[PDB]
Each structure stands twice: as structure tokens, then as C-alpha cells.
Write a protein that holds these residues in place. Sequence first.
Motif, short mmCIF file in Angstrom:
data_model
loop_
_atom_site.label_atom_id
_atom_site.label_comp_id
_atom_site.label_asym_id
_atom_site.label_seq_id
_atom_site.Cartn_x
_atom_site.Cartn_y
_atom_site.Cartn_z
N UNK A 99 48.74 86.44 65.37
CA UNK A 99 48.86 87.50 64.39
C UNK A 99 47.63 87.63 63.52
N UNK A 100 47.04 86.49 63.14
CA UNK A 100 45.81 86.52 62.36
C UNK A 100 44.72 87.27 63.11
N UNK A 101 44.47 86.88 64.36
CA UNK A 101 43.34 87.43 65.10
C UNK A 101 43.51 88.92 65.31
N UNK A 102 44.66 89.33 65.85
CA UNK A 102 44.90 90.75 66.06
C UNK A 102 44.84 91.51 64.74
N UNK A 103 45.47 90.97 63.70
CA UNK A 103 45.41 91.61 62.39
C UNK A 103 43.98 91.66 61.88
N UNK A 104 43.23 90.58 62.10
CA UNK A 104 41.90 90.48 61.50
C UNK A 104 40.94 91.49 62.11
N UNK A 105 40.94 91.61 63.44
CA UNK A 105 39.97 92.48 64.10
C UNK A 105 40.14 93.93 63.67
N UNK B 13 43.82 70.63 69.22
CA UNK B 13 44.72 71.56 68.56
C UNK B 13 44.36 71.73 67.09
N UNK B 14 44.06 70.63 66.41
CA UNK B 14 43.65 70.72 65.01
C UNK B 14 42.33 71.47 64.89
N UNK B 15 41.40 71.23 65.81
CA UNK B 15 40.09 71.86 65.73
C UNK B 15 40.21 73.37 65.77
N UNK B 16 41.05 73.89 66.66
CA UNK B 16 41.22 75.34 66.73
C UNK B 16 41.75 75.89 65.42
N UNK B 17 42.77 75.24 64.86
CA UNK B 17 43.31 75.66 63.58
C UNK B 17 42.25 75.56 62.50
N UNK B 18 41.44 74.50 62.55
CA UNK B 18 40.33 74.39 61.62
C UNK B 18 39.42 75.60 61.71
N UNK B 19 39.02 75.96 62.93
CA UNK B 19 38.20 77.14 63.11
C UNK B 19 38.99 78.39 62.77
N UNK B 20 40.31 78.35 62.96
CA UNK B 20 41.14 79.51 62.66
C UNK B 20 41.03 79.89 61.19
N UNK B 21 41.08 78.89 60.31
CA UNK B 21 41.00 79.17 58.89
C UNK B 21 39.56 79.26 58.42
N UNK B 22 38.65 78.52 59.06
CA UNK B 22 37.25 78.55 58.64
C UNK B 22 36.74 79.98 58.65
N UNK B 23 37.00 80.69 59.74
CA UNK B 23 36.67 82.11 59.78
C UNK B 23 37.51 82.88 58.77
#
Lengths: 153, 92, 43, 49, 43
Positions: A99-105, B13-23
Motif C-alpha cells: 500500500x505504501x509503494x502504490x500510494x507513494x508513486x 525481511x528487516x532490511x526491506x522494512x528498513x529501506x521501506x521506511x528510509x525512503x
Amino acid sequence: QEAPEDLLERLLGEMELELIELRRALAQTIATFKSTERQRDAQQLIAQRWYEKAQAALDRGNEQLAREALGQRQSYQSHTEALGKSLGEQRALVEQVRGQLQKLERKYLELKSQKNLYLARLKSAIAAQKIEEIAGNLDNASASSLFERIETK
Amino acid sequence: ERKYLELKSQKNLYLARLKSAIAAQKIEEIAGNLDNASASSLFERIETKILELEAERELLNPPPSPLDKKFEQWEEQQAVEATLAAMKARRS
Amino acid sequence: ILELEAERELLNPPPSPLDKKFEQWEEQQAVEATLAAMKARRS
Amino acid sequence: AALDRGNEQLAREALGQRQSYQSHTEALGKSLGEQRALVEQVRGQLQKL
Amino acid sequence: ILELEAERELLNPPPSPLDKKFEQWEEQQAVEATLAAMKARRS
Ligand SMILES: Nc1ncnc2c1ncn2[C@@H]1O[C@H](COP(=O)(O)OP(=O)(O)O)[C@@H](O)[C@H]1O
Ligand SMILES: Nc1ncnc2c1ncn2[C@@H]1O[C@H](COP(=O)(O)OP(=O)(O)O)[C@@H](O)[C@H]1O
């Protein structure tokens, strides 16, 4: 401290590059996510084979031997539940990520829709001042304007 | 060994979430607002600059006076009617 | 992870409970209004 | 045709499905309205200039 | 192998369950509509 307009392009230049990097890793978690998904299914089948032995464990008419196999699988059964629950939380966990990614773009595009629009208006007025400032007057009467300078001469 | 694998199952799995919020912070922090109204956001910075020259040019050349435009349009209206007089004059 | 989670939220206030409540209700009214179109077009 | 089957239930999902776009439609529809006269002011400058 | 599998999927959203559900149902309605042609042409 730089030109506010010029840094915009550089800002948006890094904007998408960072964005895509996220898109790369998102698939990464999903790939391993299914890897365990298959892994769980493998172990339960092994229990089924153990269960299959259990079903025919009495084909001899002996109930004793079936007991060992039934006690044998239970080690896997707990492991089955242990891993089975593990993916349950992750299932909705990644979904929140999508949801974040789709929402974000969608947000990004609206920005670019105006990115060039402001620049044109910027150039629109940049000349506007440039033009009339240079064309301040022709009969200035003070010699400050270029035209009157010639007139007095 | 069985313990080790469970660790790696989450390592990435944590790394992706880390990058998920970092952006996520990076994106919206850069995209904090477009109508900030305080010049702190990049968009409003440009907006104020646009208006900065807008009045700058106006001062360098006084605009028409309300009377000037009012007589100008009325003069056109009188011209309109005067041309309308030509309308009646030529048609009748 | 949570450190930035709220950090982003502060930088942009989230929807108010009334805002979402009216928003979904407005959709529900739109749903019923579209449902009125459902009845209008079907009957 | 959601009711061609005679079922009103399924039509509901589609009607709720579009609404996401409907708001997006209005969101973008208004967006160009302001720009429409905005550029027009620009053209007057250039021709006048 | 799976790494790219989902990578491609993200780049292009797949059909929605409703989309496929209406799509197949639309085919079923087409099937019945063609079945109506079956009855129409045979009888
Ligand atoms: N309608 C007008 N008719 C005659 N002269 C004008 C008119 N409008 C402006 N001017 C002249 O233009 C001059 C302003 O030109 P500018 O160079 O911008 O300032 P400055 O006069 O201080 O050099 C004024 O001094 C004025 O005499
Ligand atoms: N819904 C809104 N409509 C108009 N302006 C808004 C809205 N929400 C926020 N703003 C503006 O965005 C600004 C906040 O942007 P930011 O740069 O993060 O902080 P600051 O205003 O201190 O620079 C506020 O000053 C506010 O005027």
C-alpha cells in the motif's frame, strides 16, 4: 545555498533513483516469503507419509508399532505449527508495505505534472522584468533610459 | 543449526522494512508540502520568487488608472455606440 | 524502524477521525446515491 | 449489466470499485481547471510583449 | 528464479479477483448468450 529552481531537477533526479531501489528489495522479501511457504508444505507432507505409515501401521494388525510413528511425526507436527504461524504475521505485514509503494508513486507524478509548469512561469516573468526593465522608457527625460541618453547627445 | 536458519529467514525481511521506511521519510520529507506558505518548502520558495518580480515590474511602469480604463472602455462604448450610430446610419 | 515511523507522521498530520468518518460516510452516501442510481437505472 | 444475472449484490462491489476512480477523476478534473486560464494569462503577455 | 517472478508481477499489477470474476462471468453470460444463440438457431 543554490538556485532554488536548479536544485529541483537534481532533487528530483535522486528522487526516482532512491524510489526504484525500494522497488527492487520489495520483491526480495516476497521471494523468500514463498520459499518458507513451500518449506512448510514439505514438512507436513513428510508427516502425511508418516501418517501414511500410520494408516498401514496396523496392516500387520499390530498397534504397538503405529505408536512409534505417531510419536515420531509429532516432532514435525509442532515444527509444522511453529513455521505455519510464522508466515501468518508476515502475510499481512508485507501487504501493508505494498500500500505504501502504490500510494507513494501516485504522489510523485502529481509533483512532476507541475515541475515544468513552474519553470515556464519562472521564465515567463524572468523575461518580463528583463524586457521592460531594458525597455523602461523611451522618453525618460532623465538620460537614464538609453533612448533619452541619445536624445540629449 | 535449526536455530540459525530461522534467523536468516528474517535477516533480509528487516532490511526491506528498513529501506521501506528510509525512503518513506526521505520521500515525504522532500515532499513535505507544495503550499507550505513559509518558503521553507521548495515549491513555495519558487512561488514567492515569482510574485517578487511580478510587483517589481509593475513599479517600474505604473499601470492604468481606474479612471483611465473607465474612460477608455467608456470611450470604446461611445465608439461602440458611435459605430452603432454608423450601424443605424448605414443600415438606415 | 519505529523511530522514523512516527517521525514521518509528525511531518504530515494524518486524517482526523471526523474526516475519515465523514469521508467513509460520504462514500456511503455516495454508495446509497449510487444505489439510488442502481434503483434509478434498473427501475 | 451487473444485474443481467438478476443479482444486485455483485453490482455493489463494482459501484464501490469505481468510486476510487471517481474521486481521482474529480481530483484531476479540477486540477486542469485552474491551469486552463492560468496559461491564457501567459499568452496575453507574449502577444502583448 | 522466484526473485524475478515477483519482480515482474510488481511492474504490472495482475487482474483483480473481481476483474477475473466478472471476466469469466461475462464469458459465462456470453456462454449463455451464445447458448441463447444455440437455442435461437436450433429452435
Ligand atoms: N507618459 C509619459 N510621458 C512622458 N514621459 C514619461 C511618461 N511616463 C514616464 N515618463 C518619464 O520616464 C521617466 C522614468 O524612467 P526611468 O528611467 O525608469 O526612471 P528615471 O526617470 O528616474 O530615470 C520619468 O522621469 C518620466 O519623465
Ligand atoms: N491543507 C493545507 N492547506 C494549505 N496549507 C497547508 C495545508 N497543510 C499544511 N499547509 C502548510 O504547510 C506548512 C508546513 O510545511 P513545513 O515546511 O513542513 O513546515 P513550515 O511551515 O514550518 O515550513 C504550514 O505552514 C502550512 O501553512
